PDB file of all heavy atoms in Angstrom:
ATOM      1  N   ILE A   1      43.256 121.884  79.500  1.00  0.00           N
ATOM      2  CA  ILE A   1      42.756 120.461  79.399  1.00  0.00           C
ATOM      3  C   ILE A   1      43.821 119.263  79.376  1.00  0.00           C
ATOM      4  O   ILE A   1      43.761 118.535  80.306  1.00  0.00           O
ATOM      5  CB  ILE A   1      41.625 120.295  78.421  1.00  0.00           C
ATOM      6  CG1 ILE A   1      40.340 120.955  79.022  1.00  0.00           C
ATOM      7  CG2 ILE A   1      41.302 118.884  78.126  1.00  0.00           C
ATOM      8  CD1 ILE A   1      39.158 120.774  78.137  1.00  0.00           C
ATOM      9  N   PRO A   2      44.828 119.414  78.467  1.00  0.00           N
ATOM     10  CA  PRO A   2      45.883 118.314  78.469  1.00  0.00           C
ATOM     11  C   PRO A   2      46.549 118.153  79.856  1.00  0.00           C
ATOM     12  O   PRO A   2      46.887 117.168  80.154  1.00  0.00           O
ATOM     13  CB  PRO A   2      46.918 118.834  77.427  1.00  0.00           C
ATOM     14  CG  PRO A   2      46.151 119.709  76.494  1.00  0.00           C
ATOM     15  CD  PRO A   2      45.034 120.348  77.427  1.00  0.00           C
ATOM     16  N   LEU A   3      46.615 119.303  80.661  1.00  0.00           N
ATOM     17  CA  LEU A   3      47.361 119.121  81.915  1.00  0.00           C
ATOM     18  C   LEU A   3      46.437 118.386  82.915  1.00  0.00           C
ATOM     19  O   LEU A   3      46.874 117.835  83.999  1.00  0.00           O
ATOM     20  CB  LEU A   3      47.834 120.415  82.464  1.00  0.00           C
ATOM     21  CG  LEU A   3      48.560 121.480  81.498  1.00  0.00           C
ATOM     22  CD1 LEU A   3      48.969 122.617  82.311  1.00  0.00           C
ATOM     23  CD2 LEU A   3      49.629 121.009  80.629  1.00  0.00           C
ATOM     24  N   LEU A   4      45.089 118.234  82.642  1.00  0.00           N
ATOM     25  CA  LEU A   4      44.282 117.529  83.468  1.00  0.00           C
ATOM     26  C   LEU A   4      43.617 116.205  82.978  1.00  0.00           C
ATOM     27  O   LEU A   4      42.581 116.015  83.094  1.00  0.00           O
ATOM     28  CB  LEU A   4      43.117 118.427  83.929  1.00  0.00           C
ATOM     29  CG  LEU A   4      43.340 119.876  84.233  1.00  0.00           C
ATOM     30  CD1 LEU A   4      42.176 120.635  83.794  1.00  0.00           C
ATOM     31  CD2 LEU A   4      43.743 120.111  85.611  1.00  0.00           C
ATOM     32  N   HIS A   5      44.471 115.516  82.136  1.00  0.00           N
ATOM     33  CA  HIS A   5      43.997 114.333  81.451  1.00  0.00           C
ATOM     34  C   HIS A   5      43.623 113.252  82.418  1.00  0.00           C
ATOM     35  O   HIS A   5      42.490 112.705  82.321  1.00  0.00           O
ATOM     36  CB  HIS A   5      44.908 113.765  80.484  1.00  0.00           C
ATOM     37  CG  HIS A   5      44.361 112.625  79.796  1.00  0.00           C
ATOM     38  ND1 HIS A   5      43.211 112.785  78.987  1.00  0.00           N
ATOM     39  CD2 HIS A   5      44.649 111.292  79.826  1.00  0.00           C
ATOM     40  CE1 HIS A   5      42.939 111.557  78.360  1.00  0.00           C
ATOM     41  NE2 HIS A   5      43.803 110.679  78.975  1.00  0.00           N
ATOM     42  N   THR A   6      44.622 112.866  83.222  1.00  0.00           N
ATOM     43  CA  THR A   6      44.400 111.936  84.280  1.00  0.00           C
ATOM     44  C   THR A   6      44.145 110.461  84.063  1.00  0.00           C
ATOM     45  O   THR A   6      44.666 109.569  84.728  1.00  0.00           O
ATOM     46  CB  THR A   6      43.324 112.446  85.216  1.00  0.00           C
ATOM     47  OG1 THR A   6      43.698 112.289  86.621  1.00  0.00           O
ATOM     48  CG2 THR A   6      42.110 111.718  85.155  1.00  0.00           C
ATOM     49  N   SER A   7      43.364 110.087  83.032  1.00  0.00           N
ATOM     50  CA  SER A   7      42.978 108.722  82.715  1.00  0.00           C
ATOM     51  C   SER A   7      44.145 107.931  82.023  1.00  0.00           C
ATOM     52  O   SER A   7      44.856 108.574  81.223  1.00  0.00           O
ATOM     53  CB  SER A   7      41.767 108.703  81.878  1.00  0.00           C
ATOM     54  OG  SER A   7      41.634 107.369  81.193  1.00  0.00           O
ATOM     55  N   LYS A   8      44.170 106.723  82.227  1.00  0.00           N
ATOM     56  CA  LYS A   8      45.175 105.869  81.541  1.00  0.00           C
ATOM     57  C   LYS A   8      44.769 105.556  80.108  1.00  0.00           C
ATOM     58  O   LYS A   8      45.624 105.040  79.378  1.00  0.00           O
ATOM     59  CB  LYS A   8      45.537 104.658  82.475  1.00  0.00           C
ATOM     60  CG  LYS A   8      46.622 105.027  83.557  1.00  0.00           C
ATOM     61  CD  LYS A   8      47.290 103.902  84.138  1.00  0.00           C
ATOM     62  CE  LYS A   8      48.159 103.080  83.095  1.00  0.00           C
ATOM     63  NZ  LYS A   8      49.048 102.005  83.736  1.00  0.00           N
ATOM     64  N   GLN A   9      43.570 105.780  79.768  1.00  0.00           N
ATOM     65  CA  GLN A   9      43.120 105.575  78.377  1.00  0.00           C
ATOM     66  C   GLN A   9      43.004 106.976  77.760  1.00  0.00           C
ATOM     67  O   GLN A   9      42.666 107.976  78.483  1.00  0.00           O
ATOM     68  CB  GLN A   9      41.853 104.899  78.328  1.00  0.00           C
ATOM     69  CG  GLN A   9      41.861 103.407  78.579  1.00  0.00           C
ATOM     70  CD  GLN A   9      40.829 102.872  79.242  1.00  0.00           C
ATOM     71  OE1 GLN A   9      40.166 101.875  78.888  1.00  0.00           O
ATOM     72  NE2 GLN A   9      40.494 103.485  80.402  1.00  0.00           N
ATOM     73  N   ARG A  10      43.178 106.974  76.526  1.00  0.00           N
ATOM     74  CA  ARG A  10      43.178 108.266  75.797  1.00  0.00           C
ATOM     75  C   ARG A  10      41.709 108.752  75.402  1.00  0.00           C
ATOM     76  O   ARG A  10      41.338 109.826  75.642  1.00  0.00           O
ATOM     77  CB  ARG A  10      43.902 108.199  74.500  1.00  0.00           C
ATOM     78  CG  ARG A  10      44.052 109.515  73.713  1.00  0.00           C
ATOM     79  CD  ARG A  10      45.010 109.417  72.568  1.00  0.00           C
ATOM     80  NE  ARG A  10      45.116 110.649  71.769  1.00  0.00           N
ATOM     81  CZ  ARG A  10      45.811 110.671  70.642  1.00  0.00           C
ATOM     82  NH1 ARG A  10      46.368 109.562  70.136  1.00  0.00           N
ATOM     83  NH2 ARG A  10      45.842 111.840  69.988  1.00  0.00           N
ATOM     84  N   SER A  11      40.908 107.790  74.877  1.00  0.00           N
ATOM     85  CA  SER A  11      39.621 108.139  74.437  1.00  0.00           C
ATOM     86  C   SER A  11      38.513 108.025  75.510  1.00  0.00           C
ATOM     87  O   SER A  11      38.728 107.530  76.605  1.00  0.00           O
ATOM     88  CB  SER A  11      39.234 107.217  73.210  1.00  0.00           C
ATOM     89  OG  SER A  11      37.953 107.551  72.852  1.00  0.00           O
ATOM     90  N   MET A  12      37.302 108.446  75.159  1.00  0.00           N
ATOM     91  CA  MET A  12      36.273 108.191  76.109  1.00  0.00           C
ATOM     92  C   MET A  12      35.443 107.017  75.761  1.00  0.00           C
ATOM     93  O   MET A  12      34.563 106.562  76.550  1.00  0.00           O
ATOM     94  CB  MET A  12      35.310 109.477  76.218  1.00  0.00           C
ATOM     95  CG  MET A  12      35.977 110.609  77.211  1.00  0.00           C
ATOM     96  SD  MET A  12      34.921 111.832  77.810  1.00  0.00           S
ATOM     97  CE  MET A  12      36.221 113.124  78.076  1.00  0.00           C
ATOM     98  N   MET A  13      35.730 106.456  74.561  1.00  0.00           N
ATOM     99  CA  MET A  13      35.004 105.269  74.106  1.00  0.00           C
ATOM    100  C   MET A  13      34.748 104.173  75.135  1.00  0.00           C
ATOM    101  O   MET A  13      33.763 103.655  75.364  1.00  0.00           O
ATOM    102  CB  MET A  13      35.422 104.754  72.737  1.00  0.00           C
ATOM    103  CG  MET A  13      35.054 103.367  72.399  1.00  0.00           C
ATOM    104  SD  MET A  13      35.403 103.060  70.654  1.00  0.00           S
ATOM    105  CE  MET A  13      34.451 101.476  70.493  1.00  0.00           C
ATOM    106  N   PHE A  14      35.823 103.926  75.918  1.00  0.00           N
ATOM    107  CA  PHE A  14      35.705 102.921  76.887  1.00  0.00           C
ATOM    108  C   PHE A  14      35.553 103.395  78.303  1.00  0.00           C
ATOM    109  O   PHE A  14      35.866 102.794  79.296  1.00  0.00           O
ATOM    110  CB  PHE A  14      36.943 101.903  76.922  1.00  0.00           C
ATOM    111  CG  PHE A  14      37.331 101.435  75.404  1.00  0.00           C
ATOM    112  CD1 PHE A  14      38.589 101.750  74.977  1.00  0.00           C
ATOM    113  CD2 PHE A  14      36.451 100.741  74.746  1.00  0.00           C
ATOM    114  CE1 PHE A  14      38.941 101.337  73.698  1.00  0.00           C
ATOM    115  CE2 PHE A  14      36.756 100.190  73.466  1.00  0.00           C
ATOM    116  CZ  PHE A  14      38.010 100.553  72.978  1.00  0.00           C
ATOM    117  N   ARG A  15      35.103 104.778  78.439  1.00  0.00           N
ATOM    118  CA  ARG A  15      34.839 105.173  79.874  1.00  0.00           C
ATOM    119  C   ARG A  15      33.438 105.797  80.194  1.00  0.00           C
ATOM    120  O   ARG A  15      33.192 107.071  79.893  1.00  0.00           O
ATOM    121  CB  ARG A  15      36.052 105.939  80.434  1.00  0.00           C
ATOM    122  CG  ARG A  15      37.037 106.485  79.387  1.00  0.00           C
ATOM    123  CD  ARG A  15      38.275 107.197  80.159  1.00  0.00           C
ATOM    124  NE  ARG A  15      39.027 108.029  79.262  1.00  0.00           N
ATOM    125  CZ  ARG A  15      39.014 109.418  79.414  1.00  0.00           C
ATOM    126  NH1 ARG A  15      38.401 110.069  80.285  1.00  0.00           N
ATOM    127  NH2 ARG A  15      39.753 110.063  78.531  1.00  0.00           N
ATOM    128  N   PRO A  16      32.553 104.987  80.617  1.00  0.00           N
ATOM    129  CA  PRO A  16      31.215 105.331  80.967  1.00  0.00           C
ATOM    130  C   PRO A  16      31.130 106.597  81.789  1.00  0.00           C
ATOM    131  O   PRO A  16      30.375 107.502  81.420  1.00  0.00           O
ATOM    132  CB  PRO A  16      30.637 104.131  81.792  1.00  0.00           C
ATOM    133  CG  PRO A  16      31.451 102.972  81.396  1.00  0.00           C
ATOM    134  CD  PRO A  16      32.895 103.520  81.126  1.00  0.00           C
ATOM    135  N   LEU A  17      31.673 106.670  83.009  1.00  0.00           N
ATOM    136  CA  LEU A  17      31.506 107.865  83.907  1.00  0.00           C
ATOM    137  C   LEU A  17      31.912 109.075  83.147  1.00  0.00           C
ATOM    138  O   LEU A  17      31.179 110.156  83.183  1.00  0.00           O
ATOM    139  CB  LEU A  17      32.253 107.783  85.139  1.00  0.00           C
ATOM    140  CG  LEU A  17      32.350 106.513  85.953  1.00  0.00           C
ATOM    141  CD1 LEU A  17      32.902 106.972  87.374  1.00  0.00           C
ATOM    142  CD2 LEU A  17      31.004 105.849  86.257  1.00  0.00           C
ATOM    143  N   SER A  18      32.924 109.022  82.462  1.00  0.00           N
ATOM    144  CA  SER A  18      33.485 110.228  81.691  1.00  0.00           C
ATOM    145  C   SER A  18      32.596 110.692  80.685  1.00  0.00           C
ATOM    146  O   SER A  18      32.386 111.810  80.339  1.00  0.00           O
ATOM    147  CB  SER A  18      34.830 109.957  81.200  1.00  0.00           C
ATOM    148  OG  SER A  18      35.800 110.187  82.186  1.00  0.00           O
ATOM    149  N   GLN A  19      31.839 109.690  80.020  1.00  0.00           N
ATOM    150  CA  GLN A  19      30.945 110.115  78.993  1.00  0.00           C
ATOM    151  C   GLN A  19      29.871 110.987  79.633  1.00  0.00           C
ATOM    152  O   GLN A  19      29.588 112.023  79.054  1.00  0.00           O
ATOM    153  CB  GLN A  19      30.245 108.814  78.440  1.00  0.00           C
ATOM    154  CG  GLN A  19      31.122 108.087  77.536  1.00  0.00           C
ATOM    155  CD  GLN A  19      30.308 107.013  76.798  1.00  0.00           C
ATOM    156  OE1 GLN A  19      30.396 105.763  77.185  1.00  0.00           O
ATOM    157  NE2 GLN A  19      29.405 107.317  75.815  1.00  0.00           N
ATOM    158  N   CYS A  20      29.294 110.460  80.765  1.00  0.00           N
ATOM    159  CA  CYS A  20      28.231 111.300  81.355  1.00  0.00           C
ATOM    160  C   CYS A  20      28.601 112.629  81.670  1.00  0.00           C
ATOM    161  O   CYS A  20      27.923 113.625  81.471  1.00  0.00           O
ATOM    162  CB  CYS A  20      27.706 110.502  82.681  1.00  0.00           C
ATOM    163  SG  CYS A  20      27.187 108.828  82.401  1.00  0.00           S
ATOM    164  N   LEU A  21      29.857 112.774  82.387  1.00  0.00           N
ATOM    165  CA  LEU A  21      30.360 114.045  82.658  1.00  0.00           C
ATOM    166  C   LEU A  21      30.553 114.871  81.387  1.00  0.00           C
ATOM    167  O   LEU A  21      30.258 116.152  81.387  1.00  0.00           O
ATOM    168  CB  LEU A  21      31.665 113.887  83.351  1.00  0.00           C
ATOM    169  CG  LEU A  21      31.551 113.263  84.818  1.00  0.00           C
ATOM    170  CD1 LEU A  21      32.690 113.401  85.614  1.00  0.00           C
ATOM    171  CD2 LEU A  21      30.335 113.987  85.458  1.00  0.00           C
ATOM    172  N   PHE A  22      30.968 114.296  80.311  1.00  0.00           N
ATOM    173  CA  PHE A  22      31.181 114.985  78.959  1.00  0.00           C
ATOM    174  C   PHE A  22      29.870 115.503  78.513  1.00  0.00           C
ATOM    175  O   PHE A  22      29.644 116.688  78.368  1.00  0.00           O
ATOM    176  CB  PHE A  22      31.645 114.154  77.906  1.00  0.00           C
ATOM    177  CG  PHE A  22      31.708 114.733  76.559  1.00  0.00           C
ATOM    178  CD1 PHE A  22      32.658 115.527  76.125  1.00  0.00           C
ATOM    179  CD2 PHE A  22      30.627 114.367  75.682  1.00  0.00           C
ATOM    180  CE1 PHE A  22      32.572 116.100  74.875  1.00  0.00           C
ATOM    181  CE2 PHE A  22      30.680 114.925  74.414  1.00  0.00           C
ATOM    182  CZ  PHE A  22      31.648 115.755  73.976  1.00  0.00           C
ATOM    183  N   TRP A  23      28.822 114.666  78.584  1.00  0.00           N
ATOM    184  CA  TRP A  23      27.496 115.096  78.195  1.00  0.00           C
ATOM    185  C   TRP A  23      26.912 116.148  79.021  1.00  0.00           C
ATOM    186  O   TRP A  23      26.215 117.033  78.553  1.00  0.00           O
ATOM    187  CB  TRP A  23      26.572 113.920  77.824  1.00  0.00           C
ATOM    188  CG  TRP A  23      27.067 113.239  76.590  1.00  0.00           C
ATOM    189  CD1 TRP A  23      27.479 112.049  76.624  1.00  0.00           C
ATOM    190  CD2 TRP A  23      27.188 113.802  75.295  1.00  0.00           C
ATOM    191  NE1 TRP A  23      27.921 111.719  75.285  1.00  0.00           N
ATOM    192  CE2 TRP A  23      27.675 112.845  74.518  1.00  0.00           C
ATOM    193  CE3 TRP A  23      26.924 115.071  74.755  1.00  0.00           C
ATOM    194  CZ2 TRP A  23      27.911 113.044  73.172  1.00  0.00           C
ATOM    195  CZ3 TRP A  23      27.075 115.177  73.358  1.00  0.00           C
ATOM    196  CH2 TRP A  23      27.584 114.167  72.637  1.00  0.00           C
ATOM    197  N   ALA A  24      27.213 116.153  80.357  1.00  0.00           N
ATOM    198  CA  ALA A  24      26.709 117.196  81.245  1.00  0.00           C
ATOM    199  C   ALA A  24      27.518 118.498  80.791  1.00  0.00           C
ATOM    200  O   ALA A  24      26.894 119.514  80.975  1.00  0.00           O
ATOM    201  CB  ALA A  24      27.108 116.839  82.629  1.00  0.00           C
ATOM    202  N   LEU A  25      28.707 118.438  80.276  1.00  0.00           N
ATOM    203  CA  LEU A  25      29.475 119.600  79.760  1.00  0.00           C
ATOM    204  C   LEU A  25      28.641 120.207  78.620  1.00  0.00           C
ATOM    205  O   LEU A  25      28.278 121.386  78.681  1.00  0.00           O
ATOM    206  CB  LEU A  25      30.868 119.328  79.343  1.00  0.00           C
ATOM    207  CG  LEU A  25      31.896 120.290  79.786  1.00  0.00           C
ATOM    208  CD1 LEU A  25      32.934 120.628  78.645  1.00  0.00           C
ATOM    209  CD2 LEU A  25      31.351 121.651  80.169  1.00  0.00           C
ATOM    210  N   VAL A  26      28.350 119.448  77.557  1.00  0.00           N
ATOM    211  CA  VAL A  26      27.543 119.926  76.372  1.00  0.00           C
ATOM    212  C   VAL A  26      26.230 120.387  76.988  1.00  0.00           C
ATOM    213  O   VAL A  26      25.777 121.563  76.616  1.00  0.00           O
ATOM    214  CB  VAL A  26      27.489 118.873  75.349  1.00  0.00           C
ATOM    215  CG1 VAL A  26      26.547 119.229  74.366  1.00  0.00           C
ATOM    216  CG2 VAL A  26      28.782 118.520  74.750  1.00  0.00           C
ATOM    217  N   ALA A  27      25.485 119.628  77.750  1.00  0.00           N
ATOM    218  CA  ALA A  27      24.242 120.022  78.279  1.00  0.00           C
ATOM    219  C   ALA A  27      24.299 121.342  79.033  1.00  0.00           C
ATOM    220  O   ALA A  27      23.602 122.267  78.775  1.00  0.00           O
ATOM    221  CB  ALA A  27      23.614 118.880  79.228  1.00  0.00           C
ATOM    222  N   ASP A  28      25.313 121.486  79.792  1.00  0.00           N
ATOM    223  CA  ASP A  28      25.533 122.772  80.559  1.00  0.00           C
ATOM    224  C   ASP A  28      25.937 123.968  79.607  1.00  0.00           C
ATOM    225  O   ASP A  28      25.412 125.060  79.846  1.00  0.00           O
ATOM    226  CB  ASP A  28      26.695 122.588  81.502  1.00  0.00           C
ATOM    227  CG  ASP A  28      26.870 123.610  82.409  1.00  0.00           C
ATOM    228  OD1 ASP A  28      25.876 124.204  82.817  1.00  0.00           O
ATOM    229  OD2 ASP A  28      27.890 123.914  82.846  1.00  0.00           O
ATOM    230  N   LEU A  29      26.492 123.628  78.423  1.00  0.00           N
ATOM    231  CA  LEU A  29      26.817 124.748  77.458  1.00  0.00           C
ATOM    232  C   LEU A  29      25.548 125.167  76.681  1.00  0.00           C
ATOM    233  O   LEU A  29      25.426 126.309  76.157  1.00  0.00           O
ATOM    234  CB  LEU A  29      27.867 124.262  76.512  1.00  0.00           C
ATOM    235  CG  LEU A  29      29.346 124.239  77.037  1.00  0.00           C
ATOM    236  CD1 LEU A  29      30.188 123.677  75.940  1.00  0.00           C
ATOM    237  CD2 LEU A  29      29.751 125.657  77.362  1.00  0.00           C
TER     238      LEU A  29
END
């Protein structure tokens, strides 16, 4: 995971697309 961070911000708080993708991860789990 840390090797694939990629974003210039650290948290997801300010990132909408990433949020959706994160939720799709949990949903997928």
Side-chain angles (χ1 to χ4, degrees):
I1 289 185
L3 322 181
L4 323 149
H5 184 65
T6 223
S7 161
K8 280 197 62 175
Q9 278 142 134
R10 181 172 182 191
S11 177
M12 280 197 204
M13 167 165 191
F14 314 118
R15 28 184 192 108
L17 314 194
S18 282
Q19 281 188 260
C20 302
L21 292 194
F22 169 87
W23 293 112
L25 223 217
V26 172
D28 194 32
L29 286 173

